[PDB]
Design a binder for this molecule. Sequence first.
Ligand SMILES: NC(=O)c1ccc[n+]([C@@H]2O[C@H](COP(=O)([O-])OP(=O)(O)OC[C@H]3O[C@@H](n4cnc5c(N)ncnc54)[C@H](OP(=O)(O)O)[C@@H]3O)[C@@H](O)[C@H]2O)c1
Ligand SMILES: NC(=O)c1ccc[n+]([C@@H]2O[C@H](COP(=O)([O-])OP(=O)(O)OC[C@H]3O[C@@H](n4cnc5c(N)ncnc54)[C@H](OP(=O)(O)O)[C@@H]3O)[C@@H](O)[C@H]2O)c1
Ligand SMILES: NC(=O)c1ccc[n+]([C@@H]2O[C@H](COP(=O)([O-])OP(=O)(O)OC[C@H]3O[C@@H](n4cnc5c(N)ncnc54)[C@H](OP(=O)(O)O)[C@@H]3O)[C@@H](O)[C@H]2O)c1
Lengths: 330, 330, 330
Amino acid sequence: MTLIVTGAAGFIGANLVKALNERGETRIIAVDNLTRADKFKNLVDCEIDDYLDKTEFVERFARGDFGKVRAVFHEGACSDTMETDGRYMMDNNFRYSRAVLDACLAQGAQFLYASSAAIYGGSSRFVEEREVEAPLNVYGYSKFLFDQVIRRVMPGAKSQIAGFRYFNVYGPRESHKGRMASVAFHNFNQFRAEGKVKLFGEYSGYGPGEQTRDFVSVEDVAKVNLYFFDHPEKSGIFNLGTGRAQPFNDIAATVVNTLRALEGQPALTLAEQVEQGLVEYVPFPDALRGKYQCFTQADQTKLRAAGYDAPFLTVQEGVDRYVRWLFGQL
Amino acid sequence: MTLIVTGAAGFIGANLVKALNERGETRIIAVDNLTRADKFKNLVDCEIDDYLDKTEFVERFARGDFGKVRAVFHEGACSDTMETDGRYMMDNNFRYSRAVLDACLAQGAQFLYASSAAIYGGSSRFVEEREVEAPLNVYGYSKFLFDQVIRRVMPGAKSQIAGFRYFNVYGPRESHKGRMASVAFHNFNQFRAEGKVKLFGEYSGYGPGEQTRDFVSVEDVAKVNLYFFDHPEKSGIFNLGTGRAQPFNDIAATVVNTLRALEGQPALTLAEQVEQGLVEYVPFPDALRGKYQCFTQADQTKLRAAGYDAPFLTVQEGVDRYVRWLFGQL
Amino acid sequence: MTLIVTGAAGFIGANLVKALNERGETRIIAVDNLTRADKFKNLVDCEIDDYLDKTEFVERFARGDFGKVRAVFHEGACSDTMETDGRYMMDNNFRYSRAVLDACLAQGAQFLYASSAAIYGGSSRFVEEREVEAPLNVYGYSKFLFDQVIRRVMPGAKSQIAGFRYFNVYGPRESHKGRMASVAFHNFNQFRAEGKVKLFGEYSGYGPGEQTRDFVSVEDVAKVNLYFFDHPEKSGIFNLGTGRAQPFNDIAATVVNTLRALEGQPALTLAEQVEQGLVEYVPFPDALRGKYQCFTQADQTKLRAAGYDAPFLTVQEGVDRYVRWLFGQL
Ligand SMILES: NC(=O)c1ccc[n+]([C@@H]2O[C@H](COP(=O)([O-])OP(=O)(O)OC[C@H]3O[C@@H](n4cnc5c(N)ncnc54)[C@H](OP(=O)(O)O)[C@@H]3O)[C@@H](O)[C@H]2O)c1
Ligand SMILES: NC(=O)c1ccc[n+]([C@@H]2O[C@H](COP(=O)([O-])OP(=O)(O)OC[C@H]3O[C@@H](n4cnc5c(N)ncnc54)[C@H](OP(=O)(O)O)[C@@H]3O)[C@@H](O)[C@H]2O)c1
Ligand SMILES: NC(=O)c1ccc[n+]([C@@H]2O[C@H](COP(=O)([O-])OP(=O)(O)OC[C@H]3O[C@@H](n4cnc5c(N)ncnc54)[C@H](OP(=O)(O)O)[C@@H]3O)[C@@H](O)[C@H]2O)c1
């Protein structure tokens, strides 16, 4: 009956908590780090039995302080793809994940954790295979390396181990994420303030805004998590995206067109938006050269094969919906 | 026989200590943090058995260093609503509270603790139910989450669990609270120093000074605590206010008129005070936008239904008396 | 045919040039100081024969560089009531006026010049008599003293000498005046930028926004000027105000209601606007204490008796038109 969500105050974690709550699961231990306070807003409409700081958790879990725990959704991680202290990164992501996993295996708790497509780096295949993994930054490396450990532990594991390589995740509860929030959230606040949105210009062969990613709503991230939570016999590392890749232009053009409908104005093509200065491009930062993915697209074979067969919200549906939820404040 | 008050050197905890002394209860263990040394003034006219820093107390209380303890008045918390380190807020408030609760439950000691009307946030109703609780800042969240825990502990709880959601408390012994002391106290000093008082202006559709709160003197706060102390059979989460919501304008008008009256001057209406420059309005801080409660009014129903039928001082009686008490200094 | 206007690129001067332009007079020497370049806008739709800086003008004028000159409209002065260098103020205002006056007398030219109601200081009568004149700042004194000199020179003067004590003037071509522009102009920009307007709070027994002035449109100012221009037989020093005094609140509220009417919204009362936060009050600046007129109202007796019988635009007609015109930039 007792559930544990780490990263609970965060974008994905709190979304999981909300989804658990909505199916009546409420005996939840929330673990996070509230040093940046505003995250708390994410848990205000939630039901949990306890809160701990990430520094007090592991040793108390291991000790059995929370009793009989059914599952741990391990979303807690430093998600700053620009953080430079790799020692911190490896301790806070990799080592920590390991102590959590060891505690789950020692107790028979299901272990559902967040991985990242950043692991793929500049690959042209996105299949859950070591062969094609080569992360561009130390964040991606911390995730990559934990995935390697998972592959060694999985065959001998009697309790569930399910890892999700989230792609570009967007949706409610990311408001606190700063520069690490999604492009859609960024585009939203930009249009509210300056009446126009921003995207990176040309870089490494891709036109302005033509860099493409697989954008997934949290709604679908939470659905997938619950599916494997419900099937403790399914273990593995799974891509979690839509299998459909789109340029950043679609995010921007969509956010703009949806904010215009909310005020009466008719939809515009991307080109009209650029023409009218509704979309403008910022020159690509030197700090991100060689460390940036210009293309990602989930191969969906593995996830579908495991029996998750529901459709995924498209950019059009999901971003439009997300902007409207965002607009819900005036 | 041994009593313990945390927050002992602060506003409400020191009023509790004195109230206990005024009934021959003097075997008190006092717990606070004297880093800001001026607080000591709150215990000079008091009788206590011991003083401990908040950091060395929880260890000694569980270990039973204080012998048999009848009750704990857990008033100690970080009361700075603008404190921004949520990790500290959750540790010093929430986690600390649970530890005190756990030791209290372990030893069958009564547990009377301070909550806060901040928990209700911008809600339209003020009844002790999860459905109207939405805190606006992390301070509120730390009080909120402890209350949720108490609702899970309570049914099984052998011993007394008394939690009081204080509203806007004013009165003596709050002199050290700086920017967190009551508006009454601020106005007094302001008047003494500049010959005028200040209030926030228009914010969120409330006119200047027209934001409204439920103001309760400490005296009433101290009576309610003693009542539940005398009644270990009574347990619950109670609103502690007067049921009567007044605008900030009233406090100021009262402070100005009481201070005028102390110098043989006639009373003015608010409309005269504003026209005379005795009341002026500072524009509303952007640091408070969306984090500020514009309306509170205690729903007394649950507190009455527990046998506390005594009447509460009004703003006119309480502020007047407090202002006169303050005027005692030269 | 040759006409001179000092302060030509400033507020009143440029209105004189345009009005003269509109009855066929285009033989105009313009004299100003364009260091703050933006005043140049004031002359764009105008016809002038020459432009000189104020520092090179007087020598050339007295020497006869401009040939026969019918009249000089002397509007050029430092109009910063908050300027603290009184040596500069007396040189740029008082001595400059005397040098221009002398040259006029010797050439036989009409001399129309700007005085100021600032001359009356905190007086309770506003008649053109020495007995009720006592300026509060050095600006006022520079005009005050010059007027005394005119009263000595006028008896045996062969050409026209007309001096106008402008009250609070408002209207187009004051965009460059900064903190010295009319309150109507300030409110317009305050409202366009923040959807609310600012006025001074209580000072010296006048409530928030209650200090009153005699507000006169530049159109009337230009009209009175043109009248005496037409009648060289009339000399003297005259009040140029409406005879009607309103509080600043009237200006504020008239500006708000007029802008609201343009966005379709309904008109509000002053107390409504104050309660809604549309009008807020700034603490009176110490730098103005004892240097600030709380009341002005022109006694029109002398102006009428000289022949000027026309009606003056009131605040409601004038400010409304000023606001609509100002709104013409979008
Ligand atoms: N598009 C996406 O959002 C995306 C894509 C790929 C992977 N992911 C993964 O999704 C997970 C959650 O991401 P998110 O979007 O929700 O970011 P997030 O909002 O920052 O959530 C993470 C929260 O957990 C905290 N935390 C960090 N390390 C922790 C630890 N060792 N134990 C417990 N809590 C910890 C973080 O706070 P502090 O860091 O300040 O301590 C943060 O508040 C991460 O594992 C991330 O790698 C997300
Ligand atoms: N208007 C009100 O007065 C109001 C309204 C709602 C709730 N409350 C609650 O009433 C209680 C008392 O508030 P107050 O007005 O008396 O403010 P206070 O004067 O600041 O009292 C708290 C004192 O306890 C200290 N303290 C902080 N954390 C502690 C801990 N974990 N253990 C022991 N002592 C600790 C504080 O010092 P440091 O913070 O410097 O460490 C402070 O001296 C608080 O819990 C507050 O949340 C008050
Ligand atoms: N509320 C009112 O509008 C009001 C009330 C009473 C009297 N007045 C008088 O009306 C006249 C015009 O005022 P205004 O509202 O039009 O202000 P203005 O816009 O500042 O116009 C005056 C212009 O004359 C320039 N100037 C200063 N000294 C000069 C000089 N010795 N010779 C030639 N030009 C000079 C000024 O530039 P710099 O100063 O930067 O050098 C300024 O550009 C002033 O004499 C003023 O005292 C106005």
